[PDB]
Amino acid sequence: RLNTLSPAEGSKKAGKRLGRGIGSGLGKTGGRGHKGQKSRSGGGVRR
Amino acid sequence: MDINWRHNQSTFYHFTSDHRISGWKETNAMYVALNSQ
Amino acid sequence: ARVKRGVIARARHKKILKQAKGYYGARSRVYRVAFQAVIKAGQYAYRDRRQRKRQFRQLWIARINAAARQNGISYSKFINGLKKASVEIDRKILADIAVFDKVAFTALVEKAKAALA
Amino acid sequence: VTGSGKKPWRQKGTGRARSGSIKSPIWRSGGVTFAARPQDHSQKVNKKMYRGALKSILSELVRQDRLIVVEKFSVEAPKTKLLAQKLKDMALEDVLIITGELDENLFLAARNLHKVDVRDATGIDPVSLIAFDKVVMTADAVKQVEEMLA
Amino acid sequence: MKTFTAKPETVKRDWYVVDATGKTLGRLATELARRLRGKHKAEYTPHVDTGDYIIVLNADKVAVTGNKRTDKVYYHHTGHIGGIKQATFEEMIARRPERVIEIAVKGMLPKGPLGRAMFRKLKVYAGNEHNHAAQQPQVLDI
Amino acid sequence: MYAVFQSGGKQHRVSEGQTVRLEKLDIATGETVEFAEVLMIANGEEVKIGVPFVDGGVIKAEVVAHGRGEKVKIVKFRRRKHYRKQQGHRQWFTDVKITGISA
Amino acid sequence: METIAKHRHARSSAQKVRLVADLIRGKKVSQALDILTYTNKKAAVLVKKVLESAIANAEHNDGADIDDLKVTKIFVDEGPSMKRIMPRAKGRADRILKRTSHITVVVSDR
Amino acid sequence: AVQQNKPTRSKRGMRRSHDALTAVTSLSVDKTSGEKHLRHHITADGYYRGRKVIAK
RNA sequence: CCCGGCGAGGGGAGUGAAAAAGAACCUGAAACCGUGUACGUACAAGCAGUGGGAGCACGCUUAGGCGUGUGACUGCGUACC
RNA sequence: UGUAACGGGGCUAAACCAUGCACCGAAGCUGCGGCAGCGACGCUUAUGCGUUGUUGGGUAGGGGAGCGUUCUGUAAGCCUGCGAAGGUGUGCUGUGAGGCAUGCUGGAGGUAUCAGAAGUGCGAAUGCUGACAUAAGUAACGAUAAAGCGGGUGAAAAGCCC
């Protein structure tokens, strides 16, 4: 029965994949808005 | 032929000449810029 | 696990290009233009599922207006007449009777003039 | 990637797009963007979750009649023919024999049989109790299992 | 079912003769445009020429109100540059009055291949007689 | 002899023995329905409605086939704003056949 | 009976050959040979050799009787290009596409 | 000096509508030799208007 | 064996299960280029579609008046990022 | 630049003012059919319905739910030379990403279900690589020292040899 075991309900959440398409919700800008220092790779200010 | 074509596309990649566009193309861009000032 | 993406990309492109048969030039050959053509055809098709209701209604009104003026009353007075005569025939059917059955349309005009007077 | 850090063309004036390295990940022959490294895939399983899981699977092997308890299970000579005949007599093809004292002759007799696996009571794992159709425990192995799983 | 569509192979269409003496230009023109579309027929269909053939005659005797006899100006441009060429209403009635009725009706008819085909059915004459006695045009009193 | 009757949402001009495609009725496949709300009966003498639906008229129609119509694609693209949404739709229909029209 | 001859890899671009092929398409064969004898093209030499080869394959490998044959199909496909280099001014080069073609003459009596 | 939209293959064939070659249109038959030649030209055997010329 | 310049290339023959497996060789996509057939197109203006839609050509079809291709004419309609 | 300050024809009312009754008019509201979210509510209790109310334009962005790809386990199982993957058509199907069946090509592999991991989905980056178009059978064929004829060889001669 190793093909009948199954995880709990709610334990494995999907994982945001950014940059794929328009339907996914997080495409083009991946959830990081328009230009600026925060929309840049490595970008962000210090603590 | 393929080797000569890759090298002879690679001819004006590191140029300097400023009156010639892209190293080689003749123009009037000196007078255009100079008249814009 | 490297995933090559040839076979599925081919399937998407082909799906779009089958939806663009009959278009002129690149619109039916090149993917990058057939994608835009297929979408713009989608937007038009939406828009025109609404306009066909508007266009058919104005066609029917023009035919009832023609046949009713052939029977000596305008469209405006004819619809007022039939509403006061409490006739609920919609105007697809009044246009269709007005083409196919001239005598029934004559009788409808008589109900309209009868109630309108 | 085995190349040079020479910039392939001048920054401005060629009509080419700007490029800086021949080892860019956008370039053919260029270097994976997020290239992988050798990594460890081990998960921590808490000890009480491992033992809990074994208690659940043993309870379901008992409940689904996939658990056979024999008093003794040993083969005469180290021959795969004898173990094949012995498992044939007991109506078992796919089987996990588990014995509290690992017999040498049994171990050599099950080494060629594909479906059959002989373990000591110490080294059982979840994936084999679930994998094999029937589990045949020696009574001594049952006692050792209860000592392991408390 | 589907709404009826007139079929241009099977459209029957009649011939009418209209005397344009002392009629107002726009009001006659609008009636002719209605009859040439085919808007007066119950089998009207917007992509089919269903209208009738109208023979307008006495086109030089058409009337306009106010000072439009002298102030109404017909401009056209010739394509050459300073080619703006005007002609008042009485100059047009003197030169070619057919152009007066035909300009009016043409501007009232839908632009496009169909409305060109609709204008081919209008036959205007400046006189009282027409060649079309073979088609037996009945007198449309409008 | 035809008859106009009101049906699901809209109206139909139908002779006898003619198959009509209506909206989805909640009727079994071989079962017969009656439309008691006929608006016109014309044979060579018209009969229509002062007050609506004709007093003595009814249409008996046998249901022929429930079904689900042609797929239509619904496309919602907002140019230049990063929004598109496609969807599809197959409308349920009911083909009936007019058994008879009673004036 | 259809009988084929081909010149694969013919050094002449397919456009230049298609002018001549468009001349003799549909003709009877002796008339087609009389057209290609007096057409002053390089492509007419190539097309004539393929047509003569197709008449010979017809009369030898198949049934005879040249006088009944007609040029039913003729078409010029494009072959592979030979990619060469023309040295232009100021140090720049071009690719010259030395173009080939594939002449096909299908001759038949029916 | 250079195009601004790539021309189609439609417009390309329309331009080539006139590039067609005209056939010969009929070539004449010699009086004596009975063989074919362009009109007003000598034959391959070197006759013209039924008399022998060149003879190489 | 035949055409061909004792060519190139081809057509047969033969091997092969298969030579549109022939060395330019497994599969053989797309762009791009052709040949053939059906329809449209030489008085008509524009993101080239879409809604309507005649006619024609092929298949049906117990004529059931459908399907496929084309698409005159007509409403609306200024690509994507 | 051309009427060119009613959209146009054209209008002496088809203008303006006052009153009135019609009709047209949108993706508004209603009718009919369908789907989905959030409440409430009697059961069904691990949820579906006789219900029932109401909501469903959407950028940045947040939340939820899925499809496909390659790889691992299930799988020494199950499909497969009575023909796999792939390629190319057709038909059916789901709200969608998609799925399923089958003709032809192909000629040897494919993989359910339920889990697991990702080099997991491209139309754009003057993106990288290959192929192929376009202008186009167009400019050009590289000193304006210059060729003409006879003969030979050859399948063919302006260019080779004499």
Swiss-Prot record, chain C:
SUPFAM superfamilies: Ribosomal protein L20 (SSF74731). InterPro entries: Ribosomal_bL20, RIBOSOMAL_L20_CS, Ribosomal_protein_bL20_C. One of its GO terms (biological process) is ribosomal large subunit assembly. One of its GO terms (molecular function) is structural constituent of ribosome. It holds the Pfam family Ribosomal_L20. The keyword Transmembrane helix does not apply. The keyword Electron transport does not apply. GO terms for cellular component: cytoplasm; cytosol; cytosolic large ribosomal subunit. Keywords: Ribonucleoprotein, Ribosomal protein, RNA-binding, rRNA-binding. Belongs to the bacterial ribosomal protein bL20 family. One of the primary rRNA binding proteins, it binds close to the 5'-end of the 23S rRNA. It is important during the early stages of 50S assembly. Part of the 50S ribosomal subunit. Contacts L21. HAMAP family: Ribosomal_bL20. This is Large ribosomal subunit protein bL20. It comes from Escherichia coli (strain K12).
UniProtKB/Swiss-Prot annotation, chain E:
GO terms for molecular function: large ribosomal subunit rRNA binding; mRNA 5'-UTR binding; mRNA binding; structural constituent of ribosome; zinc ion binding. SUPFAM superfamilies: Ribosomal protein L13 (SSF52161). Disulfide bonds: none annotated. It comes from Escherichia coli (strain K12). The lineage of its organism: Bacteria, Pseudomonadati, Pseudomonadota, Gammaproteobacteria, Enterobacterales. The gene is rplM. Part of the 50S ribosomal subunit. Keywords: Ribonucleoprotein, Ribosomal protein. Pfam families: Ribosomal_L13. This is Large ribosomal subunit protein uL13. One of its GO terms (biological process) is cytoplasmic translation. The keyword Ribosomal protein applies. This protein is one of the early assembly proteins of the 50S ribosomal subunit, although it is not seen to bind rRNA by itself. It is important during the early stages of 50S assembly. GO terms for cellular component: cytoplasm; cytosol; cytosolic large ribosomal subunit; ribosome. Belongs to the universal ribosomal protein uL13 family.
UniProtKB/Swiss-Prot annotation, chain F:
Pfam families: Ribosomal_L21p. InterPro entries: bL21-like, bL21-like_sf, Ribosomal_bL21, Ribosomal_bL21_CS. GO terms for biological process: cytoplasmic translation. The keyword Ribonucleoprotein applies. One of its GO terms (molecular function) is rRNA binding. The keyword Ribonucleoprotein applies. Keywords: Ribonucleoprotein, Ribosomal protein, RNA-binding, rRNA-binding. One of its GO terms (cellular component) is cytoplasm. It comes from the Bacteria. PANTHER family: 50S RIBOSOMAL PROTEIN L21, LARGE RIBOSOMAL SUBUNIT PROTEIN BL21M. Belongs to the bacterial ribosomal protein bL21 family. Part of the 50S ribosomal subunit. Contacts protein L20. This protein binds to 23S rRNA in the presence of protein L20. This is Large ribosomal subunit protein bL21. It comes from Escherichia coli (strain K12).
UniProtKB/Swiss-Prot annotation, chain H:
InterPro entries: Ribosomal_bL32 (IPR002677), Ribosomal_bL32_bact (IPR044957), Ribosomal_zn-bd (IPR011332). GO terms for molecular function: structural constituent of ribosome. Transmembrane segments: none annotated. Residues 1-37 are annotated as: Disordered. One of its GO terms (cellular component) is cytoplasm. One of its GO terms (biological process) is response to reactive oxygen species. HAMAP family: Ribosomal_bL32 (MF_00340). Part of the 50S ribosomal subunit. Contacts L17. This is Large ribosomal subunit protein bL32. It comes from Escherichia coli (strain K12). The lineage of its organism: Bacteria, Pseudomonadati, Pseudomonadota, Gammaproteobacteria, Enterobacterales. The gene is rpmF.
